[PDB]
Design a protein around this nucleic acid. Sequence first.
RNA 1: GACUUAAUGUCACGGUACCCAAUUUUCUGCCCC
RNA 2: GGGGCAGAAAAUUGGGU
Lengths: 659, 1211
Amino acid sequence: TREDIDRKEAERLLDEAFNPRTKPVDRKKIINSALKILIGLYKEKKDDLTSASFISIARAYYLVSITILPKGTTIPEKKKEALRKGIEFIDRAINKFNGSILDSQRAFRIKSVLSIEFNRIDREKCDNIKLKNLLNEAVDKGCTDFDTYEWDIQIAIRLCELGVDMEGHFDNLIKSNKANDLQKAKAYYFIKKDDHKAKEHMDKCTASLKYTPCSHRLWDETVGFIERLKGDSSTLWRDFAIKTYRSCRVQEKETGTLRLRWYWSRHRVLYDMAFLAVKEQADDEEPDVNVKQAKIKKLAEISDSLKSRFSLRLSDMEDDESNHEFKKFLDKCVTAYQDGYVIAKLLELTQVPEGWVVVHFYLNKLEGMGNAIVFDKCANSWQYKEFQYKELFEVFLTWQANYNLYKENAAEHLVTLCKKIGETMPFLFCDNFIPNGKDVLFVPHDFLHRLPLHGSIENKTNGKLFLENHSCCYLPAWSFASDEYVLLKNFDQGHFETLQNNQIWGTQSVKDGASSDDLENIRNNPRLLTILCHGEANMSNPFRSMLKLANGGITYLEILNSVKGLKGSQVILGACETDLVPPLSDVMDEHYSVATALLLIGAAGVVGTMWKVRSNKTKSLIEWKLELNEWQKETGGAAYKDHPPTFYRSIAFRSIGFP
Amino acid sequence: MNITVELTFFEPYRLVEWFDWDARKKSHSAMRGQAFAQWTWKGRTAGKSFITGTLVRSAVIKAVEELLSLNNGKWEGVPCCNGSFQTDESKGKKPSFLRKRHTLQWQANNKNICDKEEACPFCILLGRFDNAGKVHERNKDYDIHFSNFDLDHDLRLVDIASGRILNRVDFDTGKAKDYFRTWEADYETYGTYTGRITLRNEHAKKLLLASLGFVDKLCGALCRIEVIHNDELRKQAEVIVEAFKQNDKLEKIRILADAIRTLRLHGEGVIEKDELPDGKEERDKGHHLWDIKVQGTALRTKLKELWQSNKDIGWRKFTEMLGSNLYLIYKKETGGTEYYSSDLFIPVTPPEGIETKEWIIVGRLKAATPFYFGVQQPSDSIPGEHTSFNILLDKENRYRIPRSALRGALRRDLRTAFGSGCNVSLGGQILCNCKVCIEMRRITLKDSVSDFSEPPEIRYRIAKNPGTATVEDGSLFDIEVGPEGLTFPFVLRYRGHKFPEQLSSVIRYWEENDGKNGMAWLGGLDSTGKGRFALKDIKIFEWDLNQKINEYIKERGMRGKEKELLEMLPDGLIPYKFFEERECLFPYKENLKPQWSEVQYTIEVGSPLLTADTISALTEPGNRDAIAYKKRVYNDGNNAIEPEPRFAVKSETHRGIFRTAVGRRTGDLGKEDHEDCTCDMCIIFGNEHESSKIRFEDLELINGNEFEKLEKHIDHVAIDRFTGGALDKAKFDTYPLAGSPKKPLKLKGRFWIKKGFSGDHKLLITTALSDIRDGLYPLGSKGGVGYGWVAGISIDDNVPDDFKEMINKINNDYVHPGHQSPKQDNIYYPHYFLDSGSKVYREKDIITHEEFTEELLSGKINCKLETLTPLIIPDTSDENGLKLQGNKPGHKNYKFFNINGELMIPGSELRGMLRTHFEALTKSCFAIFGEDSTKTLGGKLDKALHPCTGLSDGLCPGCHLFGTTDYKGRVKFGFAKYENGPEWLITRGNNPERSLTLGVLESPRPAFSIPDDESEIPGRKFYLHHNGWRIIRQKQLEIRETVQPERNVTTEVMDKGNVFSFDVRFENLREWELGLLLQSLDPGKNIAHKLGKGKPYGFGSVKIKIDSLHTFKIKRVPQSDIREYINKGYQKLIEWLPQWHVIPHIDKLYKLLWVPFLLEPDVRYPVLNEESKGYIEGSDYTYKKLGDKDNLPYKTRVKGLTTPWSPWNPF
RNA sequence: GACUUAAUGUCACGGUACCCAAUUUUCUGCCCC
RNA sequence: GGGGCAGAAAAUUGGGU
Ligand SMILES: [Zn+2]
Ligand SMILES: [Zn+2]
Ligand SMILES: [Zn+2]
Ligand SMILES: [Zn+2]
């Protein structure tokens, strides 16, 4: 009777763990104790272990699979091991005759839903044959009690997703008091093909999604259903894609005051396919100019929403006021991940200073060809164009690899990259898309951030530089746009010995050998803050990318909290090149450099430097004390044909900010 | 023109199953090992090894592109194009392997675009325009063909390869994300591969030969491409185990397994010619382990028989397999994250005129501390144990520093020097371009082994249970650690245009200069200071790879002949004279130098230090039950190992002492379980989810040459509470180091501090160090006896100033009346029994040894120890101490206990007397009893007074306070130094004029105490304080000529009024427990304890007085606070100035130790009928008349117990 | 010759078997028919 | 008319990646 009693105790503790009341931190310890108890049971009872102990083991292994979070972007190996162990331990249970109808039904249900979860995690381990076997087992057992166990409801909807008729359980699933709206919508659309009831449940489902964190089960499975609809060439996928976009935007609008987001490996495709939906709506033979313009504006809005936030894996996630919000957000997300299974002032996209044309960039991986949503206030007209970025990505990777070995000697690769930008984006030099003599603001996407868009070269024999005609300033996203002179220096001896010594243009509250305290101690907001130090890159957490100042330097996070006296000041971070702050590009680059932290604090604009340049050029830029795009043309930055290395230095300087 | 090309591997290359192109994708191991050597079977064993010609071709074309780039695409004067490494999937099929690697490119300089008429050497070595394409071997239409490379000699897989599990370690933490197995082969025996290269086009032979000479590594190893008694010993072990089971000694068959396993360190001559301990001369049993009758013969002789019958496998292999065998038999009877990891062409164009060079860093990686390069157990390393942890060795058993571990440590140090690196990702389609990766892709380094194939010393480890301060259930494991001082050759090749300052910083960090001392943490177990290698003998060379590449090809880059380079002259290898010094590198002093901060200090131990290494106690001669731990240091200067081994406190013991001190200071120790926690102890010392921020090192003994005898032989015993003699099996002798207050032991240890400690954490570590200095945590075993007590700490002057700054910061009025003895002046019995009763109190809620509770007290007590009668504490280390055996052989002459020539009292005796007194005082159970003795003696002790078993049933107040098995006591006594006084009791006629030949000391007979089953059991036995030494002094000549010389024992005696000073470091003691211990120490005037031999003769009467009581939560309490402690002790006693005689049991107790001479009562044992000194005529006092049932009734127990001073001759 | 390669593309030198645990707890070198 | 014990009981691996 030892097996039965300890199995009953294990069932008690598993039921207590399944209650959503307990925090996930203690849930791990209690379920580990349950695992220890059940394995201790299994040690002496390997000879045809009873059905109850095996069922408890399967439930416990499912729960150990759920409690372990995906540390990286990919599915964690521990979850796969837990799934494999659960199915392996339940194979012996299902291979033997339990003798109880209820126990056999429970075993079949848990095995089939475990196979479904393994298929969701990785189709290689369990293919559609496994799903068909799960259907056979469920039909044989008859575990279709929708009003008793939501476990049966989940297996029913998964089975119906396999393209097999489920009209036998249709009446039971019609009521489904324990189900959620998305399951009802899936059942209505798949079996009965009734779009009205499907959309009626869909609206409630997305309304509920509006108030749930991104780590919930509902988000991933609803985006999966939407992409299933898109692959089915249906017509209602666009509306729910846009509605899920809206729910995601509203949900994270308030949460994450530090410009943070939760990664779930399906957010990017959700935004991509909502973008595709609104794009198809825009080009759906619209007779009215107003509706097409509004659709393109919505295109720009969704492009900006993805850029306006962060993307941090919880491995990197795992004064003190900022840390409180960090801990609260992490706790809420990690709680909502497991709750799925257990029972200052905003800026409008249309208000822009007169004579400024903005170029919003969006790179959609699903479609495979990027977009450039432009907007000029001369005619107040929104228009967008499409372009290929894969070959441009090859050329950019070529330049990045050649630069990290031969920084100054890779000027030819920079010229090639600029020519590739001009060729792959011919609308930049087009009069209709971008009028000449108009100041341009860029909002580049993931890997377009590193591109010197201001240095684009037109596809001509004597292709004119894009910098000569337009004045360009960049921006990580549209959500970032909103006296004396101060200098800070932490460089090495032998460089920049002139500004520190001969300082007749200002630098009253200056600090040679500056520390993080010196940057934080700037009380009054100056007219120009100059920071002289080469910062280091954080290849994992962009929140901890630092400027190498004295006393350990100041990171991205410490700028957001300690530094307050910098509002409305044209900071010039012309000491560290822009590309030693963040990591390097691989397919996408969603990391934010230190200049973005300065912009978020309230700096009027950072005159950064894309690539490493000799000290003389940036020293001359600092000595240029009149209020970029005009200096580069006059200093010789348009001589790429004759002087490649001269083009390499001048182009590097870009102003990250919106005047 | 067929070209025969021969491979040669100079370090262990890697192996995988061949599988197939269409079948590789199903297997992760073979998909990861595409670049390894391939194994194909011929049963799943005894196959053939080979290297694919495609892999060799890829290496050759990579070398071709590197040679052309180094020459701006122009080899030997003929221009070479860029080739083409892009395949259009529309116009054909993709290659079997895709590059996803940066391709070195140059200018064109070609007369015409390459076609199949005048192709450049690069194109015809690539096979661009040959008649053979991506299709298979069909016809030999290849312009250049690379045939398969088969091994150059069945060939069983286990004979060639050896499975090893590799790793991928974090950087923020010291943990590993995942791991993966590998089949690293045997480069020494099976390390030569032969294949054929066929080249139809004769225009590009020179470039092909240069590329062959330029291929620097293949399959994970350096290459030089050159043109043209089980199943019977196990049965005998089973027989041995069965015979052990016949003797009911299966609990120690495991210990015999460890002794056999560690016999590998000893030579075969140990078992050939008897060097094992032979036991005592008259033991009649011999050794408890080696003189065991197994199958009718002693274990030593049959082990010699086995060694003679198993000479084939050799002493090391035979003893290893034997130990594993008995371990398996003992286990049989009792019951006993593998992560195996789009289409882009990235042309890299080196600038014209750049200068690229190759730098060789040849040196030696001397181990400053014993190292541990972990490896998986045997029977799990098979491709296709007894020791818990194994160290990595090759087929020749020599110690190995694997290329993977060295490369990983170098990468970690390089990332530290840069300060901004990546967590290396697996399966990425784009080369990582971070700073550390760029230099790591240019650094190649050689796997190297030490020329020292000797068995590794086993370093044992346990885990203490904080609740009881004893060993934990299933906490014992052993680790094989390499010797300290071993020198491994160090090879490091960097290829590039300039030597990075970060690699120079790593070398200087690793180098062992006059003050650098070496900082290359290699391998695992870094938290216990295992693997800090001090790289030395550094020599930096360089190749002019641009204008001197012909001789680089000719010498093959000196690959595999780095020993010749370290010994000393090849062309184009001028030494690198521009190696920046330590104080010239910004990254070094910025990131690497402040990474680890050394805290060196010298512990001064003023007591016998005993680390209790028991496995080596069995094998080493002398028959010591517990000897001190000693290291095994390899003398690199003179080769071999030092014959004299260094005594030390294990770095694990050091780390555990500091960790326990910190945990008890804060309170983290004692938690239910350490989950993913960020507590103070978890952060400082690491946990299961991170790495330690502090790494400790061995407490090596530096003051060892100033001792006449470094190890002092101390005998111990356990005395039965009832009979008063030693227990049935309790005599044991330890072998601690010689430690005295006048001449202490100096142990210079150190630990390293990471640059992340906050002020609170550094304050915590300094508080732990101060607690170590204050003596709260004695080193080694028997700490509650007086073993390894720390007398102070002397921090070195090289410690950082901030760290050093924080570090530098009675009479009792009770008088017992007494009776009888002064009312007559009559002879009494030398011993009496204290029937205290069976009312025993047990405390279920035991006091844990976790953080010091504020309610209770802890500290130290300084007590003076005055003697009222001569004290006998023999030093039984020397059986001939008085040099009197020559005149009278067989006489046991002893010397007074002394360490380094100063008279001391071992703390064991003081603790024994105090524990017995306290147990009698509090009605504690009989902690030590001769159970199952002739029903049985232990079967008639009622029920409560039995010795305490495990904590299930609770612990008696004496057992709670002084401790029992699996519960460390809360009071530690110390060795009592002399501190002045009248030293010796002169006899004027003794052999040394300062001794006293004692009478016949016979074992007690409980039959007299219990003459029949009617009497249940007498109480505890105590001896009165009679002045009976006077009769022995007077009858010195009458006892040296009448008693047997072989039975008489003589020893030096201390004179009257000798004082002794010792400490009592009570900890976590209750408010009343401290008072009761104070009363036990100093019962008051006219009451004194008995110590040492001759207690029935009146010898060794000791009076204890208290000097000063301390308490910390340093606060010397006053006399008022000393009172009201004993008061509540009395209050607790009654409910179970104080008036102790109120309680009858305490009244009789204090009557037993009442001194009736502080008039002169005479007390002695009776005699057998008309024996010597019969005195029959008047006060007969003889046995067989006093003991006769007719003459005297069975009321002897009535008069012998509960009557502390009843007369015998009149009644 | 096969037992094994595919050829205009093999960063696998592309990954430290790594992290946590105090050989310690208890015991007078003692003693009489 | 004689020396009696000279070691005893535990823990010898558990957790992770
Ligand atoms: Zn060519
Ligand atoms: Zn990297
Ligand atoms: Zn902790
Ligand atoms: Zn007890």
